């Protein structure tokens, strides 16, 4: 963490400084200042212990802060989240007996590198032809966030099992959290006592609704959702579910029940689903040939999927094209020439306070030094109104 | 569409998201010294001129680096002046082993006997890695090639 460093802790620096200061202590009586000379054994031996001791001495303040964050407010040490989808199994024929797809049934994509396992046993009653069950990814990570019908290959054959396919794009793949995310998670525990501000409300609603969801709290916003008509005593919540879609009414009801015993008596709580604005990107860039065109496209797509994460986006805030260009270029190995969002080069303002961006399509036109033009197009969402 | 919700007194969804802060005394810098040596296993000596914690750790515990235990048994900062005539509690050698507590802890793999004590005694007993089995030391080197970020 960004804690001040008490003393200099470095092997080579310790050797050099220990020779120079030995020269200084005597009135120039010791002149072997050569950091790699004949005094290197003595100085290096002393500096080995010096560094292995000062390295631990420099950790005192961070150790105290970590002990505070661990003991008095236990905080789980989050490691990651596994992506989940909904598989559908379809049988070859109508059976006279009830089919059973066992727990931990392995399915995979066409490449065979991404593997999902069924949560529990699936019982398809006799006479039925299809049955759905949830599946979880093999490992944590954002690479398991696949599209619909992207997982259809299965190794173990079952009798009369015709097909299997994921009917829901797998979501909530997370490789872990950074130090600042854990800091925010710890600090919200410090200050959520009595949800009063916009921030406070949102953090509470994101809890108890899942990890990978979003909330937007607006004060004095009535049922008409018109800003110019403020209604004192009204708090409007706008929700995006764990799947990245506008919140289902059951989730709305759950969050309402959760927040009911926490709002000020006499105040009115309104909850409605959030709205999504689709972002279509067109990139014309020059490649330095340090990566292949496919590798560049994959890296840019991954960076943009990180950028347009609803956890990384503030609802109602305009999307800045310079920020998008910086996120694209942070991939490296390319030079941006032109970028279009929604058929323009200008910043995209959200229509209202509760609209979240959601980038859907991106076209690549990558040119290298030799003059090869690589053109590609990627659609990331299943449909406009998803 | 908007659903209206009004202040309730107590739901069952207030039990859903409930405790956020859990006071836990797990292993941290302020919990190294939770366990204490019994008073019956100590010696109540007096501080005399020419005395040091090195001498006390040498005579009594046979090891010069054992002084951390003695200070940890007395709550004193070693570099602070221990006045002449002040009393100290020196741990015994043979009676330091009964200050180590034995707990059977459960696990999905299986129940394990675990030794817990103040960290100074744990380091002194495990000096030279004699107590730990070779499998643990081999495991610590299973991850050998450490990934670093280029900057």
């Amino acid at each position: 963490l960004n804690a001040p460093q008490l003393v200099v802790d470095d092997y080579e620096q310790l050797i050099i400084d220990s020779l120079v200061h030995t020269n200084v202590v005597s009135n120039g009586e010791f002149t072997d200042l050569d950091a790699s000379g004949f005094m290197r054994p003595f100085a290096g031996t002393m500096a080995y212990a010096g560094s292995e001791l000062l390295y631990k001495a420099n950790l005192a303040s961070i150790a105290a802060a970590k002990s505070f964050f661990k003991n008095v407010l236990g905080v789980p040490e989050d490691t990651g989240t596994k992506a989940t989808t909904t598989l559908q199994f379809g049988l070859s024929a109508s059976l006279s007996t009830d089919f059973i797809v066992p727990i931990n049934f392995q399915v995979s994509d066409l490449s065979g590198t991404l593997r999902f396992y069924t949560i529990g046993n699936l019982v398809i009653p006799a006479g039925a032809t299809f049955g759905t069950i949830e599946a979880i990814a093999e490992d944590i990570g954002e690479k398991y966030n696949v599209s619909a019908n992207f997982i259809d290959q299965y190794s173990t054959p079952l009798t009369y099992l015709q097909y299997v396919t994921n009917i829901r794009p797998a979501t909530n793949g997370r490789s872990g959290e950074t130090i600042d995310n854990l800091i925010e998670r710890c600090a919200q525990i410090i200050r959520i006592r009595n949800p009063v501000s916009a921030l406070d409300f949102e953090q509470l609603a994101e809890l108890t609704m899942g990890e990978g969801s979003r909330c937007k709290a607006i004060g004095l916003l009535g049922i008409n959702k018109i800003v110019t008509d403020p209604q004192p005593g009204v708090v409007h919540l706008f929700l995006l579910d764990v799947n990245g879609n506008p919140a289902d009414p059951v989730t709305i009801s759950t969050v309402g029940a959760t927040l009911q015993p926490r709002i000020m008596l006499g105040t009115r709580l309104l909850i409605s689903p959030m709205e999504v604005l689709n972002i279509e990107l067109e990139l014309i860039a020059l490649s330095d040939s340090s990566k292949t065109f496919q590798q560049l496209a994959d890296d840019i797509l991954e960076a943009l999927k990180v950028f347009f994460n609803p956890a990384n986006l503030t609802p109602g805030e305009p999307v800045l094209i310079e920020e998008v260009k910086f996120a694209i270029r942070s991939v490296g190995g390319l030079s941006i020439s032109y970028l279009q969002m929604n058929d323009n080069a200008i910043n995209i303002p959200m229509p209202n306070q509760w609209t979240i961006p959601r980038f859907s399509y991106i076209g690549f036109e990558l040119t290298d030094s030799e003059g090869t033009v690589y053109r590609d197009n990627v659609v990331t969402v299943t449909n406009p109104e998803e | 569409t908007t659903q209206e919700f009004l202040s309730k007194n107590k739901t069952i969804e207030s039990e859903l998201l409930d405790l956020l802060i859990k006071p836990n005394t797990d292993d941290s810098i302020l919990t190294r010294n939770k366990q204490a040596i019994a008073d019956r296993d100590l010696f109540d000596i007096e501080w005399e001129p020419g005395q040091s914690l090195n001498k006390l750790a040498t005579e009594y515990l046979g090891d010069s680096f054992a002084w951390q235990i003695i200070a940890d048994a007395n709550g004193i900062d070693p570099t602070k002046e221990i006045d002449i005539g002040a009393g100290l509690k020196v741990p015994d050698q043979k009676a330091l082993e009964n200050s180590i507590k034995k707990f059977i802890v459960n696990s999905p793999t299986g129940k394990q006997l675990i030794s817990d004590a103040k960290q100074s005694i744990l380091n002194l007993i495990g000096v030279g890695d004699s107590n730990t089995e070779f499998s643990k030391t081999l495991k610590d080197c299973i991850g050998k090639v450490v990934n670093f970020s280029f900057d």
Partner: peptide
């Protein structure tokens, strides 16, 4: 003298409806 011999070991540690049915006759009663 009583002598004890113990042999011990360590275990390893960890659709809407059916398709077709025969025709039925229904009689209101």
């Amino acid at each position: 003298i009583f002598t004890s011999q113990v042999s011990a070991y360590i275990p390893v540690a960890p659709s809407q409806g059916v398709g077709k049915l025969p025709v039925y006759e229904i009689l209101s009663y």
